[PDB]
Amino acid sequence: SDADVQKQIKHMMAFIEQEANEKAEEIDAKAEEEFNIEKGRLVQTQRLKIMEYY
Amino acid sequence: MIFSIWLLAFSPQMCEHLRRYNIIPVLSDILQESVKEKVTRIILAAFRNFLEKSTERETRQEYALAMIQCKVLKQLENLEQQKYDDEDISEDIKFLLEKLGESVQDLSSFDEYSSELKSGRLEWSPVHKSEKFWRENAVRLNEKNYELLKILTKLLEVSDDPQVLAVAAHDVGEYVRHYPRGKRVIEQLGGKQLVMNHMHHEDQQVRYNALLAVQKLMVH
To answer: Subunit info (chain B) (predicted)?
Structure first.
């Protein structure tokens, strides 16, 4: 019983740490993706308005 | 004695006040335990006086609902099917069946769970056990300034019954499962501490439901 509950608690701890590492991996990836998207859209929009004014 | 209660119930002002004696359960017990013609009639008379003389709508609803928490309406249908020769039985049965025919709709809500909490009758009941309730309503544990959470927390704090404790841990498990912000609310109320202590409860049913609640609380 109670040592095997502690084994299950250790499996739960491993799942918690693993899925926390996956959430860090996902959010760090989606940060760099949305940096590429937002920078690219923002420069390309303003650059093209300047191009027509001149 | 129920004739004495029927006579007490003649005044609206008495019906507003008589609620604190918890009298509807003892009449409802005798209404199941004693089919005697006189006893049947004077309970129907007492119940009709309590409900019909309640000019306060809250008090009228409360007498109709207390009879429905005692499930009197089903026994009134049993007594409608039973042979009685008296109109003062028959017509007061049909009166109460109509009025309790309101409050049966109130109770037979998910609020059969609300009443099980309010009365402290926590059990492995169909409304505790069924997913549909939580899946459609789990957020409601925050109602009436967190009253249902406060009840479950108090029961997990001071109940002696491992069924109540395990049922309450299951209720917390499904609350967090079906309402994600409920995790934050249990964490803000500190109710988790009770569940984490009951991991070492003397009952394996409590320890299992406590672990299962800890799983549903901490594991995705």
So the answer is: V-ATPase is a heteromultimeric enzyme made up of two complexes: the ATP-hydrolytic V1 complex and the proton translocation V0 complex.
Check A5 against B199: CB less than 8 A apart: yes
The approach used to solve this structure was cryo-EM
**B219 has a chain A CB within 8 A of its CB:** yes
Three-state SS across chain B? CHHHHHHHCCCHHHHHHHHHHCHHHHHHHHHHHCCCHHHHHHHHHHHHHHHHCCCCHHHHHHHHHHHHHCCHHHHHHHHHHCCCCCHHHHHHHHHHHHHHHHHHHHHCCCHHHHHHHHCCCCCCCHHHHCHHHHHHHHHHHHHHHHHHHHHHHHHHHHCCCHHHHHHHHHHHHHHHHHCCHHHHHHHHHCCHHHHHHHHHCCCHHHHHHHHHHHHHHHCC
Contact B215 A16 (CB under 8 A): no
